[PDB]
Design a protein around this motif. Structure first.
Motif, PDB file in Angstrom:
ATOM      1  N   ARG A   6       0.821  -1.211   0.000  1.00  0.00           N
ATOM      2  CA  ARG A   6       0.000   0.000   0.000  1.00  0.00           C
ATOM      3  C   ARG A   6       0.855   1.260   0.000  1.00  0.00           C
ATOM      4  N   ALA A   7       1.951   1.256   0.755  1.00  0.00           N
ATOM      5  CA  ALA A   7       2.847   2.402   0.769  1.00  0.00           C
ATOM      6  C   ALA A   7       3.693   2.472  -0.493  1.00  0.00           C
ATOM      7  N   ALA A   8       3.923   1.334  -1.150  1.00  0.00           N
ATOM      8  CA  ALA A   8       4.648   1.341  -2.413  1.00  0.00           C
ATOM      9  C   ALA A   8       3.812   1.950  -3.528  1.00  0.00           C
ATOM     10  N   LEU A   9       2.537   1.576  -3.614  1.00  0.00           N
ATOM     11  CA  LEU A   9       1.664   2.109  -4.652  1.00  0.00           C
ATOM     12  C   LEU A   9       1.078   3.469  -4.307  1.00  0.00           C
ATOM     13  N   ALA A  10       1.416   4.039  -3.148  1.00  0.00           N
ATOM     14  CA  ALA A  10       0.768   5.261  -2.683  1.00  0.00           C
ATOM     15  C   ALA A  10       1.164   6.489  -3.486  1.00  0.00           C
ATOM     16  N   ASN A  11       2.289   6.445  -4.198  1.00  0.00           N
ATOM     17  CA  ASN A  11       2.784   7.613  -4.909  1.00  0.00           C
ATOM     18  C   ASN A  11       2.476   7.596  -6.398  1.00  0.00           C
ATOM     19  N   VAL A  12       2.248   6.423  -6.989  1.00  0.00           N
ATOM     20  CA  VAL A  12       1.799   6.362  -8.374  1.00  0.00           C
ATOM     21  C   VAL A  12       0.350   6.818  -8.429  1.00  0.00           C
ATOM     22  N   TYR A  13       0.048   7.742  -9.344  1.00  0.00           N
ATOM     23  CA  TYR A  13      -1.213   8.470  -9.258  1.00  0.00           C
ATOM     24  C   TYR A  13      -2.403   7.623  -9.691  1.00  0.00           C
ATOM     25  N   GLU A  14      -2.252   6.840 -10.764  1.00  0.00           N
ATOM     26  CA  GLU A  14      -3.370   6.051 -11.276  1.00  0.00           C
ATOM     27  C   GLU A  14      -3.764   4.945 -10.305  1.00  0.00           C
ATOM     28  N   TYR A  15      -2.810   4.455  -9.537  1.00  0.00           N
ATOM     29  CA  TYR A  15      -3.002   3.421  -8.543  1.00  0.00           C
ATOM     30  C   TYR A  15      -3.325   4.086  -7.203  1.00  0.00           C
ATOM     31  N   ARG A  16      -3.179   3.333  -6.102  1.00  0.00           N
ATOM     32  CA  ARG A  16      -3.629   3.649  -4.722  1.00  0.00           C
ATOM     33  C   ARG A  16      -5.092   4.096  -4.644  1.00  0.00           C
ATOM     34  N   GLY A  17      -5.905   3.682  -5.611  1.00  0.00           N
ATOM     35  CA  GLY A  17      -7.341   3.712  -5.474  1.00  0.00           C
ATOM     36  C   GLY A  17      -7.926   2.327  -5.353  1.00  0.00           C
ATOM     37  N   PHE A  18      -7.094   1.299  -5.207  1.00  0.00           N
ATOM     38  CA  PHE A  18      -7.479  -0.086  -5.441  1.00  0.00           C
ATOM     39  C   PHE A  18      -7.491  -0.949  -4.196  1.00  0.00           C
ATOM     40  N   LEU A  19      -6.507  -0.792  -3.315  1.00  0.00           N
ATOM     41  CA  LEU A  19      -6.301  -1.727  -2.220  1.00  0.00           C
ATOM     42  C   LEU A  19      -7.164  -1.442  -0.999  1.00  0.00           C
ATOM     43  N   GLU A  20      -7.867  -0.311  -0.958  1.00  0.00           N
ATOM     44  CA  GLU A  20      -8.639   0.087   0.213  1.00  0.00           C
ATOM     45  C   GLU A  20     -10.124  -0.234   0.074  1.00  0.00           C
ATOM     46  N   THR A  21     -10.478  -1.121  -0.846  1.00  0.00           N
ATOM     47  CA  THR A  21     -11.865  -1.393  -1.203  1.00  0.00           C
ATOM     48  C   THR A  21     -11.971  -2.869  -1.572  1.00  0.00           C
ATOM     49  N   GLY A  22     -12.995  -3.225  -2.342  1.00  0.00           N
ATOM     50  CA  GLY A  22     -13.429  -4.605  -2.425  1.00  0.00           C
ATOM     51  C   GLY A  22     -12.648  -5.470  -3.390  1.00  0.00           C
ATOM     52  N   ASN A  23     -13.324  -6.029  -4.398  1.00  0.00           N
ATOM     53  CA  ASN A  23     -12.708  -6.962  -5.335  1.00  0.00           C
ATOM     54  C   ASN A  23     -11.587  -6.278  -6.107  1.00  0.00           C
ATOM     55  N   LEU A  24     -10.350  -6.672  -5.808  1.00  0.00           N
ATOM     56  CA  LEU A  24      -9.158  -6.033  -6.344  1.00  0.00           C
ATOM     57  C   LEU A  24      -8.902  -6.392  -7.800  1.00  0.00           C
ATOM     58  N   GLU A  25      -9.544  -7.438  -8.303  1.00  0.00           N
ATOM     59  CA  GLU A  25      -9.371  -7.850  -9.687  1.00  0.00           C
ATOM     60  C   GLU A  25     -10.283  -7.072 -10.627  1.00  0.00           C
ATOM     61  N   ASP A  26     -11.469  -6.696 -10.142  1.00  0.00           N
ATOM     62  CA  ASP A  26     -12.412  -5.939 -10.951  1.00  0.00           C
ATOM     63  C   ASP A  26     -11.915  -4.540 -11.265  1.00  0.00           C
ATOM     64  N   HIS A  27     -11.032  -3.982 -10.439  1.00  0.00           N
ATOM     65  CA  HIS A  27     -10.459  -2.681 -10.748  1.00  0.00           C
ATOM     66  C   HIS A  27      -9.502  -2.767 -11.927  1.00  0.00           C
ATOM     67  N   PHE A  28      -8.713  -3.844 -11.996  1.00  0.00           N
ATOM     68  CA  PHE A  28      -7.849  -4.053 -13.151  1.00  0.00           C
ATOM     69  C   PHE A  28      -8.659  -4.308 -14.412  1.00  0.00           C
ATOM     70  N   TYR A  29      -9.754  -5.071 -14.299  1.00  0.00           N
ATOM     71  CA  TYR A  29     -10.604  -5.321 -15.464  1.00  0.00           C
ATOM     72  C   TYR A  29     -11.294  -4.049 -15.955  1.00  0.00           C
ATOM     73  N   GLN A  30     -11.795  -3.225 -15.028  1.00  0.00           N
ATOM     74  CA  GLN A  30     -12.435  -1.964 -15.390  1.00  0.00           C
ATOM     75  C   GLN A  30     -11.450  -0.990 -16.028  1.00  0.00           C
ATOM     76  N   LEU A  31     -10.227  -0.893 -15.487  1.00  0.00           N
ATOM     77  CA  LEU A  31      -9.239   0.029 -16.050  1.00  0.00           C
ATOM     78  C   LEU A  31      -8.714  -0.462 -17.389  1.00  0.00           C
ATOM     79  N   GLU A  32      -8.609  -1.777 -17.565  1.00  0.00           N
ATOM     80  CA  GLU A  32      -8.252  -2.323 -18.865  1.00  0.00           C
ATOM     81  C   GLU A  32      -9.329  -2.035 -19.894  1.00  0.00           C
ATOM     82  N   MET A  33     -10.603  -2.149 -19.513  1.00  0.00           N
ATOM     83  CA  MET A  33     -11.653  -1.875 -20.485  1.00  0.00           C
ATOM     84  C   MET A  33     -11.754  -0.393 -20.813  1.00  0.00           C
ATOM     85  N   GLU A  34     -11.429   0.483 -19.861  1.00  0.00           N
ATOM     86  CA  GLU A  34     -11.401   1.911 -20.172  1.00  0.00           C
ATOM     87  C   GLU A  34     -10.235   2.269 -21.094  1.00  0.00           C
ATOM     88  N   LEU A  35      -9.059   1.673 -20.880  1.00  0.00           N
ATOM     89  CA  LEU A  35      -7.950   1.885 -21.811  1.00  0.00           C
ATOM     90  C   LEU A  35      -8.234   1.312 -23.200  1.00  0.00           C
TER      91      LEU A  35
END
Lengths: 158, 345, 159, 74, 48, 199, 402, 50, 159, 159, 159
Positions: free
Chosen positions: B266-295
């Motif tokens: 969490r402290a490692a990803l805290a400075n990259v801007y697009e990340y550190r919205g992911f680990l403090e909430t629910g299904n951590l895989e759905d965030h990668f799937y949602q961001l991949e579909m937006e890209l």
């Protein structure tokens, strides 16, 4: 006869006409095509933004009008009967080069900024005044070229 | 510019892939799939889409969720093989490089099944038919990784990727195969990134660079979140698994390589801007799937680009995953979490 | 005409008067295009920083203003019966301001793109961007100075 | 001698046009029309080429009556 | 289609002591599990 | 490596050394670009103008035609109702060659035969220069216009194959881009307006 | 009227109670084909090919054919009308197998005596009743007359076609009770394109009607004065009719004032009864109607184009193969003219009827889809297609599933 | 007032026309040289999962 | 010889007579090669569409026929004692038909490849392919017309 | 020598006589090489189709025979005291047949490779390959015709 | 004019006076652009090191100041009636300072980028960066010295 108007003098004035038309047309076409790719790229998701997004295409069509004005003003001074010294031919070639390369650079800038600003407009609707502002900054380069060609045109016929 | 010399070979391919793209399911079609009661209603509702007459000539009573995902994946694979047959030059190479990443998964699956003494034919199915490479069923012999490599893997296009994998020299178990496979996929992503940087033209170049950046970043975060299980791993022996590409390598894979707990990640990803919205909430895989579909959605706004093939491939795979999830929720009477599909269109 | 003042003499003056505005327009166009791509990529997330990040586009337009100044000042010195000395001075002044403006425009474009993308996520980097852009602006200013000092000598005691 | 039916029409129709066309061209060679021989170029003699064009029309006639009875057998 | 793959693997496995030999079946051999006509041939490999 | 850049650098070095040597002798006016323009036959300039006009116009037309035709054929596999609709995007690329035809028909009425006396008069040299530059002006403008209208036609075919309501909004951009060839046509007619025949 | 209806429905299904465009297409499509295909013998071969399909209709509509013979059979009356009109056009061009006819007395007269090799001229002893005169056959300047002849033919026929198709818009607007469309769209476009391009046609016919050598006046250039009507108004080098220095300026200002009179009345009548969508659509309709006058009337040069090239390729084919075998006395000459006539007939049936008929056929189709039906044909409607019972053809339905 | 004794006007007109035609021949041959075959549609593949 | 009819005059006529058939053969070869690769890739699955898809190869061969026509008509006007006017007209006619045929051949090749590959799986696309190929065939026709109108003036009132 | 017959006149004839066989040999070599790679890749599986697929190599060799014919016919017309008209005609004939044979050889090579690889697995594609190769052969035939029609006029009424 | 003082003589002086500021502006622009990209990538994480890392941009601007000095000193020695000796000396001085400044600017840009990115995570590397940048600065200083020693001899005992 006259050592100031030899008969090879119209070649440079017609070269000025050719440069002023062709390179301005090239800049206008680059701007129009490169912006229209982005305008129709946003057209599948949000088709309600296309009729406002036609600012970079209308903006890059004025550059062909710049080249048109300067080309017809150069071609109005050429005649197979007049004096027409070599100084007038060098001035006409410099008019054509000024308008042509200024409009080419301006059309390239309008195309780049219009493509990226219209593609990234489907997300943020507050980004529009920045688009129009940077396009206004890109439009004035061809205007500068047309001003120096107007001054060279009124200077060369003396 | 980009629209000048592109169409000469790729205009037909681009138009056909855009036509495939126009048959992606939108939100209303997924809601109509959600409102189905039985599974025959799901078949009849899918029949009025780009899929239609795909479960024709099957049955009315042999209809199963596994059969639906088999046929919905086979339609994808036949369309990809058609588009790959209609190409040449750099586009043919690019699609072979799309295939190699599934070839790596088939290698790891066949070795792992060979360790546990399973059947050849059981592992030959469920083995992703796109990454085939003819000498694949020969990987079920001779357990030692060398006696795979000096016999069958040198003649495959996966041969330049084992330049790190010869450190341990014993028989394999389930963690050694995953260390191997991670080194494979690292070397693979960097090969394909240096391929895109030098040959693909520019509007497709930047789109493929950011999509490969996201692939590398997702796998880096997954290795950092899976490596803190019950083992002792040197940060020198873990940083050879995180790829040197992406927006978190120049310095943020360093803190992933030097991390012990979940709070270290969490402290490692805290400075990259697009990340550190992911680990403090629910299904951590759905965030990668949602961001991949937006890209991938942002990749369909460029027109003269062969990023469209990769974007459509990933979008159609997500579409098959969504239809499988909805079919499971229909067939098992588990309608509480049926609206957890991922739809961007 | 004359051995000091031949007939081919206004060619170099017309080429210099063209090349000034041509190369400064190319430099300004590169700076405007690169910085505008940076602004349009940045300001999707922070639309409130849109009119704050407009500085590299303005510092790119000042270069085209420099080229316009030198082109007008050269253009009001052309003549049919000028010397080769005047044409060589005008060609040198045009090349000086044009290629200096081209280099300054390339630097302003690259630094402005990187600075806008960096200052989207670090508010203290904006003043450092302004400092580096001022160091990129003085190069075109130096070209303007050399062009003016050449043009001030184009017609002193020329026979 | 395999089938020999789809090539019968291709020769009968060809000969049927050939007889009529070379017959009228030979008749126009015979009476000097001043558009087939009315210049310093290709023919000079007149009916001496009308001779061989009527000969070629006769040869087309025997092509036609040969191949026109082979198509009759089907 | 797989004779060259056989001999490549068995050369890399028998280290260079292979006595591979093949003769062709002229007619295609019709398949039932698939529908390819499948030109086939025989083989023989000696070892101890 | 890079054989074309080696050719360009070699030509540049040879031209610099040759002109610098013609300075070195003191004979820098032997490279006389103006006397080359007098002593060259005006019919060469006129016929290069006409031929390069019609050739460059046809090249721009063909370019635009296959750009929009590849994308329209590819997009018509799933939606085959785009062909008769976006026929007009190939019409717009085909009228470019007709503009080149009109220019060739206008210019070829001025190719008369002159006398050996007053062959290199003022009017004949003017006519050669005007026909040459007017022909390559309208030809290069037609080339660029055909390229741009073809690119917009390919993008319009893709967007209309998405749904039917978009081609009215993208066809406007083709209307913008198709005026540029007409600008080249007008100025090519105006540059050779006062040029006489060859007499 | 079925094949021409299938022709016009391939472009678009017309609006309800709109004027059908398949009724004038019946005759205006094979004639615009025929101008490009102006040969007696090639239209005669096309009629023979058509009558081989028309004379057995009952035998052919019970067979299974596939995609080429289908387009051959469903358009048999199209091919029949194309061949008959091509006979009439090739009679008026005086061209049979790239040869002339000599069926009337000529209007030109050769001199009394000349040495073998003297360049002489003819003396114009009258006019020739139907067709081109046969005294233009070799003559070494036949293209110089024929090009300026048939170009003016193509421009006149294209203008008559456009101004006939434009009146269907008036017959539409008068039927739908749409009196604002008349005053807003019919009159501006009619005045704008008549006063520019029908004046050119009147000047072409008037230049034909006037004898310039007997009057001692120089014959003007119509292309030159058409350019100088717009690019230098008021100045005339050669005079055509007495008071034309003012008529040019009047027609120029009328075509000018039709530009703000269009794009103004149809939106601002909707305003006083602007919206944005009507205004922008009317600006698009004005910038599209204008600049299609120039483009569409330039596009009728294809009638001249394909006619000239068909005549030239057929002439080179006649002088290349069968012309060789005319000076070959002996027994070798018999087989030589046999083989060379076989080669000539195979080429004039393969590359010169089939491969240039398909081209000019779809050119007569482009001249109706684009230049003709952009003036009256509104567009979108839904086709009829009732519920009916049909045979189902099993193996199509198996391929439709799989 | 001749241009040159060795670089005459006829020789320069011939060389300029020849250079233009050589330029266009080189361009067109560069178009011909980039010309591929799409071998994937000319092969067969079994893939026993399918 | 004469100032109107120099000795270097048949060079331009021979270059035009060569360049016509040369550039039309290059255009026809590109069209035939690209369309033939498309046909051979398509007709493995549908061998019944083999003689239906042969149309782009024929429309590529018509361009070479155009070049052959112009080369024969130019070749029967060469002479030892012709003018520079005739040689310039012959060179212009050859360049016109050659480069128009080259552009038409490139367009026919690319459109024919895409159209055959598309019409393998959509039977309604064949007529659209024929329409676009006719629009690609009239370009070489226009070049042929300009070449014939030039060649008709090569020997009118030349002294 | 003479103003009509200078001393540099056989240079163009020798260049044409060389360039005919040179460019037809390059075209024939490309066709033979590409088609032979296609045959050797195909006939590992079907060795019974080996002598059936030999057709593109023969149709490539016919182009070199065309170039040999034109080179012999030009070579038997060289002379020390010929005109510039004859040398220009010989150079034009050589360039015509050479570059037409080069284009035809490229087309024959590419179409023959694709056709052999396609006809390995579709027996109905062989006749379509033969049709497209005949359309590629007539281009070199057209170049041969233009070269013969030029060469027939090289010595008519030349003084 | 005179054999020692021809009319083309100020051309070399104007070319040298232009080329000095042109090539020093290109070198300064490369150094400023590369170092500014390095600063903007570095100072997202450590904004407190922003005004410490500004040194390579200043050492790039000193090169443009060198070129400005040489251009002013050459520009105040031009004349209509100067010798070829003076023009050759001015051209040599301009080329010397320009290409030395170009090489020094490339070195300053590359070393400054690497040094800023390295000193973000190693505070003892800043003084080593300053040492290597001083070694890159003395190259443009040497070019300035050679240009001044040439320019001091441009008008000594010239007739």
């Amino acid at each position: 006869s006259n050592i100031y108007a030899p008969l090879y003098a119209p070649f440079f004035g017609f070269a000025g006409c050719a440069a002023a038309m062709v390179l301005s047309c090239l800049g206008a076409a680059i701007g129009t095509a490169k912006s229209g790719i982005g305008i129709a790229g946003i057209g599948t998701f949000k088709p309600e933004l296309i009729m406002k997004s036609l600012i970079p295409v209308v903006m890059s069509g004025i550059l062909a009008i710049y080249g048109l004005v300067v080309a017809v003003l150069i071609a109005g001074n050429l005649s197979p009967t007049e004096d027409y010294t070599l100084f007038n031919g060098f001035m006409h070639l410099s008019c054509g080069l000024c308008v042509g390369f200024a409009c080419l650079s301006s059309g390239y800038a309008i195309g780049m900024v219009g493509d990226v600003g219209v593609r990234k407009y489907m997300h943020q609707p507050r980004l529009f005044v920045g688009i129009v502002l940077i396009l206004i900054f890109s439009e004035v380069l061809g205007l500068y070229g047309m001003i120096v060609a107007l001054i060279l045109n009124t200077r060369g016929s003396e | 510019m980009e629209g000048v010399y592109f169409n000469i070979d790729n205009g037909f391919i681009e138009g056909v892939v855009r036509g495939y793209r126009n048959g992606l399911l939108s939100n209303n079609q997924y809601i109509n799939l959600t409102q189905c009661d039985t599974l025959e209603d799901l078949k009849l509702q899918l029949s009025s889409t780009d899929y239609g007459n795909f479960l024709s000539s099957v049955s009315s009573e042999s209809l199963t969720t596994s059969l639906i995902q088999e046929y919905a994946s086979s339609k994808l694979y036949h369309e990809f093989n058609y588009i790959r047959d209609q190409s040449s030059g750099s586009t043919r190479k690019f699609m072979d490089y799309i295939t190699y990443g599934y070839m790596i998964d088939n290698v790891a699956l066949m070795i792992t099944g060979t360790i546990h003494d399973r059947d050849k034919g059981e592992i030959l199915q469920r083995c992703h038919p796109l990454g085939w490479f003819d000498t694949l069923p020969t990987l079920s012999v001779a357990t030692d990784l060398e006696s795979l490599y000096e016999t069958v893997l040198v003649d495959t296009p996966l041969a330049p990727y084992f330049k790190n994998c010869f450190d341990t020299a014993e028989e394999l178990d389930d963690m050694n195969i995953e260390i191997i496979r991670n080194k494979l996929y690292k070397a693979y992503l960097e090969d394909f990134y240096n391929f895109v940087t030098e040959e693909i033209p520019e509007p497709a170049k930047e789109c493929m660079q950011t999509l490969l950046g996201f692939e590398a970043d997702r796998r880096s975060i997954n290795i950092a979140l899976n490596s803190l299980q019950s083992s002792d791993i040197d940060p020198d022996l873990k940083s050879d698994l995180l790829p040197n590409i992406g927006k978190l390598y120049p310095l943020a894979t360093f803190h992933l390589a030097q991390a012990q707990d979940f709070e270290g990640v969490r402290a490692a990803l805290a400075n990259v801007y697009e990340y550190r919205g992911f680990l403090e909430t629910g299904n951590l895989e759905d965030h990668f799937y949602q961001l991949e579909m937006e890209l991938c959605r942002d990749a369909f706004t460029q027109q003269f680009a062969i990023s469209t093939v990769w974007a459509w491939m990933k979008s159609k795979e997500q579409e098959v995953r969504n239809i499988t999830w909805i079919a499971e929720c229909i067939a098992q009477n588990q309608r509480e979490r049926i609206n957890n599909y991922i739809s961007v269109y | 005409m004359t051995e000091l003042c031949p007939v081919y003499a206004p060619f170099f003056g017309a080429i210099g008067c063209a090349s000034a505005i041509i190369f400064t327009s190319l430099g300004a166009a590169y700076g405007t295009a690169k910085s505008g791509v940076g602004i349009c990529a940045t300001c999707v997330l922070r639309p409130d920083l849109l009119f704050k990040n407009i500085v590299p586009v303005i510092m790119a337009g000042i270069i085209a203003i420099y080229g316009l100044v030198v082109s007008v000042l050269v253009c009001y010195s052309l003549g049919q019966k000028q010397a080769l000395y005047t044409g060589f001075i005008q060609l040198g002044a045009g090349l000086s301001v044009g290629l200096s403006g081209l280099a300054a425009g390339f630097a302003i474009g690259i630094v402005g793109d990187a600075g806008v993308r960096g200052s989207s996520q670090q508010p203290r980097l904006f003043v450092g961007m302004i400092l580096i852009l001022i160091f990129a602006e003085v190069l075109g200013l130096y070209g303007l100075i050399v062009a003016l000092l050449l043009n001030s000598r184009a017609t002193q005691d020329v026979v | 001698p395999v089938v020999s039916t789809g090539k019968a029409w291709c020769c009968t129709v060809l000969s049927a046009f050939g007889v009529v066309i070379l017959s009228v061209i030979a008749h126009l060679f015979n009476t000097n029309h001043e558009s087939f021989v009315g210049s310093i170029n290709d023919p000079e003699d007149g009916p001496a080429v009308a001779h061989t064009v009527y000969l070629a029309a006769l040869v087309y006639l025997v092509f036609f009556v040969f191949c026109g009875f082979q198509v009759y057998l089907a | 289609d797989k004779v060259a793959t056989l001999e490549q693997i068995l050369w890399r496995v028998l280290r260079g002591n292979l006595f591979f030999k093949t003769v062709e079946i002229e007619q295609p051999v019709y398949d039932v599990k698939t529908r390819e006509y499948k030109h086939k041939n025989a083989f023989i490999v000696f070892s101890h | 490596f890079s054989f074309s850049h080696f050719l360009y650098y070699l030509v540049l070095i040879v031209v610099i050394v040759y002109g610098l040597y013609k300075l070195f002798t003191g004979h820098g006016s032997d490279i006389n670009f103006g006397k080359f323009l007098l002593r060259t036959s005006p019919y060469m300039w006129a016929n290069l103008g006409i031929a390069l006009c019609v050739g460059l116009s046809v090249v721009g037309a063909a370019w635009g035609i296959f750009i929009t035709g590849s994308s329209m054929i590819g997009a018509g596999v799933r939606a085959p109702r785009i062909t008769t609709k976006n026929l007009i995007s190939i019409i717009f690329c085909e009228v470019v060659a007709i503009y080149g035809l009109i220019i060739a028909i206008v210019f070829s009425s001025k190719l008369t035969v002159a006398t050996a006396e007053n062959m290199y008069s003022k009017s004949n040299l003017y006519t050669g220069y005007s026909l040459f530059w007017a022909g390559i002006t309208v030809g290069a403008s037609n080339l660029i216009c055909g390229i741009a209208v073809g690119i917009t036609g390919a993008t319009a075919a893709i967007s209309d194959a998405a749904d039917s309501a978009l081609f009215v909004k993208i066809l406007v951009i083709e209307i913008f881009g198709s005026i540029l060839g007409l600008l080249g046509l007008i100025v090519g007619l105006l540059m050779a307006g006062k040029a006489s025949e060859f007499q | 009227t079925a094949g021409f209806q299938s022709i016009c429905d391939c472009y678009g299904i017309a609006q309800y109670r709109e004027i059908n465009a398949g009724l004038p297409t019946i005759v205006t499509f094979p004639f615009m084909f025929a101008i490009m295909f102006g040969d007696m013998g090639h239209g005669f071969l096309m009629t023979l090919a058509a009558l081989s399909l028309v004379l057995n209709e009952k035998k052919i509509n019970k067979m299974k054919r596939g995609e080429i013979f289908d387009m051959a059979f469903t358009g048999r009356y199209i091919i029949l009308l194309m061949g008959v009109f091509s006979m009439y056009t090739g009679f008026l061009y005086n061209d049979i197998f790239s040869k002339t006819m000599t069926i009337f007395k000529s209007g030109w007269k050769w001199p009394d005596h000349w040495k073998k090799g003297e360049s002489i001229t003819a003396t114009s002893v009258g006019t020739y009743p139907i067709g081109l005169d046969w005294a233009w056959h070799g003559t070494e300047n036949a293209l110089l007359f024929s090009n300026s002849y048939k170009m003016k033919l193509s421009i006149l026929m294209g203008f008559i076609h456009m101004t006939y198709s434009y009146f269907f818009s008036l017959a539409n607007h008068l039927y739908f009770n749409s009196m604002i469309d008349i005053i807003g769209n019919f009159i501006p476009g009619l005045l704008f394109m008549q006063g520019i391009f029908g004046y050119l046609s009147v000047c072409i016919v008037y230049k034909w009607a006037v004898d310039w050598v007997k009057d001692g006046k120089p014959a003007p250039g119509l292309l030159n004065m058409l350019i100088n009507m717009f690019l230098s108004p008021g100045t005339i080098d050669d005079e055509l009719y007495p008071h034309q220095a003012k008529v040019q300026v009047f027609l120029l200002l009328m075509a000018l004032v039709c530009i703000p009179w269009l794009l103004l009345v149809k939106p601002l009548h909707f305003k006083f009864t602007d919206f944005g969508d009507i205004m922008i659509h009317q600006v698009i309709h004005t910038i599209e109607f204008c600049l299609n006058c120039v483009s569409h009337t330039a596009s009728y040069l294809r009638l001249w184009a394909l006619s000239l090239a068909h005549a030239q390729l057929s002439s080179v084919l006649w002088t290349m193969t069968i012309q060789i075998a005319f000076g070959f006395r002996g027994f070798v000459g018999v087989f030589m003219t046999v083989a060379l006539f076989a080669m000539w007939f195979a080429l004039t049936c393969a590359v010169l009827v089939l491969m240039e008929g398909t081209s000019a056929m779809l050119h007569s189709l482009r001249l109706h889809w684009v230049e003709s039906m952009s003036k009256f044909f509104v567009g979108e409607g839904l086709p009829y297609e009732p519920f009916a019972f049909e045979y189902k053809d099993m193996e199509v339905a198996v391929a439709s599933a799989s | 007032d001749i241009l040159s004794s060795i670089w005459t006007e006829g020789l320069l007109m011939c060389l300029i026309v020849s250079a233009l035609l050589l330029f266009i021949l080189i361009v067109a041959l560069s178009w011909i040289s980039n010309l591929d075959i799409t071998y994937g549609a000319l092969e067969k593949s079994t893939n026993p999962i399918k």
